[PDB]
Amino acid sequence: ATGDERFYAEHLMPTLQGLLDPESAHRLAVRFTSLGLLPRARFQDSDMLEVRVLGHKFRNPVGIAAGFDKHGEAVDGLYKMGFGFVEIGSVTPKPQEGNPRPRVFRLPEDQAVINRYGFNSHGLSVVEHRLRARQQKQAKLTEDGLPLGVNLGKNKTSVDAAEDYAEGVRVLGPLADYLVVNVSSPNTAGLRSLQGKAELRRLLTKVLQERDGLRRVHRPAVLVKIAPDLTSQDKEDIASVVKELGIDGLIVTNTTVSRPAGLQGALRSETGGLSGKPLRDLSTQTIREMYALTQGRVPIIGVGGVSSGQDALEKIRAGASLVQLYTALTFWGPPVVGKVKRELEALLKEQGFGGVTDAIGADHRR
Ligand SMILES: Cc1cc2nc3c(=O)[nH]c(=O)nc-3n(C[C@H](O)[C@H](O)[C@H](O)COP(=O)(O)O)c2cc1C
Ligand SMILES: CC(C)=CCC/C(C)=C/CC/C(C)=C/Cc1c(O)c(Cl)c(C)c(C=O)c1O
Ligand SMILES: O=C(O)c1cc(=O)[nH]c(=O)[nH]1
């Protein structure tokens, strides 16, 4: 509706993408966000958008997904952009470079991205100090309805995956409102095998024990982030383990290793995870499945191809309590956040929902 949305989407972003390679663009976006060089978002969040979940108030249900701010450099700039919550990461225990460049690719004709970053990470110690420098500022933000998530990965050469995640819980758990056990990156060999029943149960038991050993004020919720490429068996098993262990929530979904028929981008056959519009409905359907398998009792953060209020509401009605976006930001720029929120509010009113909370899982009750 606004002129700024139009200017960014039709002119500024496509022009700048024509000038800058994907990883240079990503780095500049992080820099510009971190320095607060963006104008403050003018959208005032209505009470209809507030969600209480995971032991926290969320001023609005639209978050920035993991992978944008991998190293916790731009958290305050992201809240300024109008995100209701920020997830940083993935962070690995030791610093690591990730894959050789180029490792990110735009598919403009599909409104999609393919990436194979491979968990490039400053490491736990660097991120720990970065978050400690603003820990009390974050405590106030959280109290004000603006929570922080930290997404944990594992190093390429580690000989004990569970210990990598445990180290992440110990080091960054005390600084996070929620932690994410990311077992769904398509870009680390053997990682997605940790989604299997026996491996997942053993990994999450260890993670939860570590979390429970933190002091009360420093004890985060623990969520598991899952792939969009799971078999029905895999999903049944994850739901079973989640309920057996009392895992606090799920993030649904990561990027897809599938390549849906109809992709037009020249770079469609690059190796990596596919994000954006072609992922959207695969993610929505995964949310729908996981909500049903967990009887609506396990909070879900829905992610994959959200670019509009309709996209957000579809995931909410399928069972998401909160949503995230990333790829839409890369195409449309900062005004997409306000756009999604304004559209979501309008649609909630049009469909007779009192607020976001009333719409969570609504399709299952039709
Ligand atoms: C360039 C890029 C880097 C990403 N890095 C991470 C990561 O480090 N950890 C993670 O859990 N997900 C990562 N993701 C996945 C996103 O968090 C999200 O699950 C996925 O992109 C679907 O959302 P979208 O379609 O709105 O981008 C990344 C995605 C992209 C496009
Ligand atoms: C996305 C954002 C906060 C933009 C602010 C305006 C700026 C500084 C734009 C210039 C850089 C640019 C064209 C970024 C778009 C872009 C990209 O084109 C791609 Cl490919 C990626 C992977 C990312 C990751 O964040 C990305 O942001
Ligand atoms: O670092 C990456 O390559 C990465 C991690 C992840 O979880 N998802 C993704 O698409 N890329």
Q: Solved how?
A: X-ray
Atom of ligand 3 nearest to the CA of 275: 10
Question: Distance between CA 366 and CA 364 in Å, rounded?
Answer: 6
Q: Estimate to the nearest angstrom the gap between the alpha carbon of 104 and the chain centroid.
A: 18
> Is the Cβ–Cβ distance between 340 and 326 less than 8 Å?
no
Nearest CA to ligand 1 atom 6: 67
Nearest CA to ligand 2 atom 24: 26
Domain count, the chain: 1
Look up 185 and say whether it is catalytic.
Answer: yes
Question: Distance between CA 281 and CA 304 in Å, rounded?
Answer: 8
Question: Distance between CA 9 and CA 313 in Å, rounded?
Answer: 22
DSSP class of 96: B
Q: Which amino acid is at 186?
A: P
Q: Is the CB of 104 under 6 A from ligand 2?
A: yes
Note the ligand closest to the C-alpha atom of 91: 1
Question: Hey, what are 291's tokens?
Answer: 């909500």
Bridge pairing between strands 56-58 and 51-53: antiparallel
Residue with tokens 């570590």: 210
Close Cβ partners of 168 (under 8 Å, ≥ 6 residues apart): 91, 93, 124, 150, 152, 153, 179
Is residue 247 classed as helix, strand or coil in its secondary structure?
A: coil
Q: Estimate to the nearest angstrom the gap between the alpha carbon of 141 and the chain centroid.
A: 19
- Ligand 2 pocket test, pick from 28, 33, 69, 80 with the greatest ligand atom count within 8 Å of Cβ, gives 28
Q: What CATH number should be reported for the domain holding residue 283?
A: 3.20.20.70
Among residues 347, 334, 362, 359, the alpha carbon closest in space to that of 40 is found at: 334
Resolution given for this structure, in angstroms: 1.8
Q: Is the CB of 116 under 6 A from ligand 2?
A: no
Close Cβ partners of 31 (under 8 Å, ≥ 6 residues apart): none
Binding-site residues, ligand 1, Cβ < 6 A: 65-67, 70, 89-90, 104, 113, 115, 117, 151, 182, 225, 254-255, 275-276, 279, 303-306, 325-328
Selecting among 185, 275, 307, 308, the annotated active-site residue is 185
Atom of ligand 1 nearest to the CA of 279: 25
Q: How far is the CA of 90 from the centre of ligand 1 (A)?
A: 9
Question: Distance between CA 122 and CA 153 in Å, rounded?
Answer: 12
Is residue 227 classed as helix, strand or coil in its secondary structure?
A: coil
Please give the angle made by the CA atoms of 280, 281 and 286, to the nearest 5 degrees.
105
Among residues 14, 112, 75, 176, the alpha carbon closest in space to that of 326 is found at: 112
183 annotated ligand binder: yes
Produce one character per residue of 129-160: b if its CB has 16 or more CB atoms within 10 Å, e if not: ebbeebeeebeebbeebbbbbbbbbbbbebee
Bridge pairing between strands 112-115 and 273-276: antiparallel
Question: Hey, what are 299's tokens?
Answer: 């909070």
C-alpha count within 13 angstroms, C-beta hemisphere, residue 261: 0
* Cis omega (within 30 of 0) for bond into 253: yes
Beta pairing partners, 115: 104, 273
Q: How far is the CA of 143 from the centre of ligand 2 (A)?
A: 30
The domain containing residue 103 runs over which residues?
Answer: 1-366
Angle between helix axes 161-172 and 124-132 (nearest 10 degrees) is 20
Strands (E), the chain: 51-53, 56-58, 62-64, 85-91, 104-107, 112-115, 148-152, 178-182, 221-226, 249-252, 273-276, 300-303, 322-325
